[PDB]
Structures are given as C-alpha cells and as structure tokens.
Design a protein around this ligand. Structure first.
Ligand SMILES: CCCC[P+](CCCC)(CCCC)CCCC
Ligand SMILES: CCCC[P+](CCCC)(CCCC)CCCC
Lengths: 360, 7, 15
C-alpha cells in the first residue's frame, strides 16, 4: 500500500545531504497520496506534508495540497549572512495538455521570518522600500512578511530517454506574482531549457545547449525581496565557480566592499556542452563531456550614481565564463557527476572552484 | 544513495 | 525537492 525512504548524498555545494519520507498512496481510501518528506543539507532544511490526487478528474487533472517549512542559513550557502525561516501552504492544479506538455496553476501562502541580517546596501535598500528602517550597526534585527501568491508553470519534455538523453528538449517555465493583501508586491519568472542534438546515427556524439533565465521585480515602489534572489555559480549553472558566487557582492555598513555574494533579481546562464564517447573501456553507464559555461547575475535596482566608488551591480554585461570536462556515471552510491573547470572569465570578488562533484 | 522499502 | 512538479519552489536551489 505505502512506502518509506531515507537517502544520503554528498556534493561540493550542499555538503552531506539527507532526505527522508513516508508515502501512503490512496491514504484511507481517499484517492489521495499522503506524503511526509524532509531534506537537510549544510545550509537548508526543508519539510512538507503533502496530499495529492493525480486523478482529481478522470482525464488526469491533478490536485495537490501541502503544508511546508523551510530554514535557510545564507552564510552556509556562501552569501552575506541572514536566516530565513519560512512556512506556509500551497494548493496546485496540474493539467496535461498533450504527451509532451503540462501546465500548472496554484495559490500559495508563505510567512517569512528574516533575522541575523548583517547590514548591507542592497538588503537595506529593499527593507527601506518596505517601510522598514533597522539599525545599520548591528545584526540584531527581525523582519517578518506574509505573502499570498498566484503560481503557474509549464513543463515541456520531449527527450528520447530520461537518463543520459541524446535527443529532444526539456523546457521548464515558472512564474509567480503576489496577490493584493501580501506584504511583498512582486513577480518572478524562471525559464530553463536543455536541448540535445545528436550528431552521429548512434547518438554517441551529442550537443547539449542549456539556458537559464530569471527575472523578478517589485510592482509599485517595493522591490522583490532579497530572499527570492537568483544566484549563479556551481555544478548546475556555471562550473568552475563556487556556488552562488556570480553577481553582486555585499556592500556592508561601517561603505565597505566585500566578496560575499548576495544574488540578484536578474540572471542569465548559457552553456554549450559536447557529449562524446567515454575514452578507455566500453558504455551506456558513463557520459563524458566538454563544456563552455557562462552566466551573469545582476541587481536592476543598484543605484550606481549614489555608489560610484563601487562596481556597478546593475550591469548585466559582466558575463562569467568557464571551460571544462565532466563525467557522469550511475554509481552504486547513486548518480555521480564530476567536473573540472577553469574560470577563464571572472570578475572582482568571484571565488573559483575548479573541481566540483555530486553524489545522489 | 537512496533506500526505499514498501509496507 | 520543494520545487518538483507540480509545486512552486520554496527552497533555495530548487527554482
Ligand atoms: C484527506 C484526503 C484529501 C481531502 P481534500 C485535499 C485538498 C488538497 C488541496 C479534497 C478536496 C476536494 C474538494 C480537502 C481536505 C480538507 C481538510
Ligand atoms: C532560449 C533557448 C535557446 C536554445 P539554443 C538555440 C540554438 C539555435 C537554434 C542555445 C543554447 C545555448 C548555447 C539550443 C542549442 C542546442 C544545442
């Protein structure tokens, strides 16, 4: 009837990651799958109780409802320090359009508890836009928000196979906008694409093109909260750069430059990867590839005139670049990804991290 | 790694 | 995990 699970992984960005869950399909004969799941890594803990009916209608329209909690510690994610403890509830409806496309629309409630904020310009500029004026000389602060959102998504998946695709595309579009009554007033949109184009008949030589776009902004005079910022850098965005390093850096208050990433409300990542046959013994379990990764994160509300003695963090043209080699293998400890990359285009304060890996 | 056991 | 289909992301690294 039901099942339970526990998992352990390891990677350069997350450290040791733990996962645990209990699922009961058709709980009490209701037609709803009931799940209790949790994750934990070096910088974040997440937990949720979900209730899901994949056949809310006999045609496959699905209904999901959940209660969740998230604890994020930003210094553990190599950002300027803050603690963000959140909880809430989401209701979502999934709509199959055809074999390759599904849509989703939902409503969300989240309460955010911000604390341990080390005073910095971008963060304090967001707080001022919210009517909040905390002390710039101490980390003793608290900022709470309650947000109601309309959520939407589109998933396109026409890959030939899920593990080691050789042909087709995967497109994920997400969006959200606050509803009147929220403390915050903003929208945020994400677009991820992956396209595999095989070169030879046997699909052993494949070209992968990947893009990641993110844009959010405040509606009215309020800004998008810094705790919804996009980040770039690491194994999944621009290899050869430490996780979340790309983009704006904190400008602390005593006017104080730094190399602590803060993220931004705009992001663009692009990547060209050449999957080749694995050298040495042979073959369907190992994927060798050579890549060119690029990315930029920026702050569209960075006031360069007021801070002309600092780098212009509203500039999108500071494109970071790296080149390297990756190896993927389904190992007895789970999926394994190893990369060695060299940042051949970095900007001041960017942290390099040539060898990166993930297990699970 | 992930271990999964039904009931 | 939190941003898996058909859920909006609620965690950093899940968007
Ligand atoms: C217990 C089995 C699940 C029941 P429901 C699940 C709603 C998820 C968003 C069925 C609602 C149909 C109109 C609501 C339960 C209220 C407490
Ligand atoms: C916004 C989607 C852009 C998809 P690409 C467009 C190629 C021209 C037709 C570019 C990807 C980054 C280099 C697909 C590359 C496939 C190998």
């Amino acid at each position: 009837t039901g099942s339970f699970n526990f998992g352990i992984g390891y990677g350069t960005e997350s450290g040791v990651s733990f996962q645990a869950g209990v699922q009961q399909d058709n709980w009490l004969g209701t037609g709803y799958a009931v799940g209790i799941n949790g994750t934990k890594n070096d910088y974040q803990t997440y937990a949720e109780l979900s209730v899901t009916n994949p056949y809310f209608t006999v045609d496959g329209v699905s209904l999901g409802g959940r209660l969740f909690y998230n604890d994020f510690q930003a210094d553990d994610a190599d950002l300027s320090d803050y603690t963000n403890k959140s909880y809430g509830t989401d209701v979502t409806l999934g709509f199959p359009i055809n074999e390759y496309n599904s849509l989703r629309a939902g409503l969300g409630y989240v309460h955010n508890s911000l604390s341990n904020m080390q005073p910095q310009v971008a963060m304090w500029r967001y707080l001022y836009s919210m009517g909040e004026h905390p002390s710039t000389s101490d980390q003793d602060n608290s900022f709470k928000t309650d947000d109601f959102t309309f959520n939407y998504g589109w998933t396109y998946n026409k890959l030939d196979r899920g593990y080691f695709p050789t042909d087709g595309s995967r497109v994920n579009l997400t969006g959200k906008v606050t509803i009147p009554g929220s403390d915050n007033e903003y929208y945020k949109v994400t677009l991820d694409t992956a396209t595999y184009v095989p070169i030879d008949d046997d699909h052993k030589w494949v070209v992968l093109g990947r893009t990641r776009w993110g844009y959010g902004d405040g509606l009215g005079g309020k800004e998008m909260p810094f705790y919804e910022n996009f980040y770039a850098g690491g194994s999944s965005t621009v290899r050869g750069f430490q996780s979340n390093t790309i983009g704006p850096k904190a400008v602390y208050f005593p006017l104080c430059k730094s190399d602590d990433a803060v993220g931004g409300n705009a992001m663009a990542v692009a990547s060209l990867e050449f999957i080749t046959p694995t050298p040495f013994i042979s073959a369907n379990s190992v994927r060798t590839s050579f890549f060119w990764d690029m990315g930029t994160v920026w702050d569209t509300n960075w006031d360069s005139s007021q801070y002309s003695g600092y780098p212009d963090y509203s500039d999108p043209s500071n494109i970071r670049m790296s080149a390297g080699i990756a190896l993927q293998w389904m190992s007895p400890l789970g999926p394994l990804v190893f990369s060695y990359a060299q940042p051949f285009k970095k900007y001041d304060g960017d942290k390099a991290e040539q060898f990166q890996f993930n297990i699970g | 790694w992930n271990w999964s056991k039904s009931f | 995990f939190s941003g898996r289909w058909x859920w909006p992301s609620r965690s950093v690294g899940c968007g």
